Amino acid sequence: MAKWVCKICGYIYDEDAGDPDNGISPGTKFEELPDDWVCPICGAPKSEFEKLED
Ligand SMILES: [Fe+3]
Ligand SMILES: [O+]
Ligand SMILES: [O+]
Ligand SMILES: [O+]
Ligand SMILES: [O+]
Numbered sequence: 001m002a003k004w005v006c007k008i009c010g011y012i013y014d015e016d017a018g019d020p021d022n023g024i025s026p027g028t029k030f031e032e033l034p035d036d037w038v039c040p041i042c043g044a045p046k047s048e049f050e051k052l053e054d
């Protein structure tokens with residue numbers, strides 16, 4: 001599945017890994033993240049993430 005990078009701090013949201021400590025199970029697509037989800041490192045909103053793909 002896809003990876004997305006936080007343009008602020010460099011955290012990688014890996015869809016295969018999810019973010020289970022913050023309520024997101026593995027295999028959760030970025031588009032399916034709640035509107036209130038933020039970067040677990042720096043707190044950046046979803047707007048500041050970019051998908052790693054051409
Ligand atoms: Fe971040
Ligand atoms: O990706
Ligand atoms: O994970
Ligand atoms: O899941
Ligand atoms: O936002």
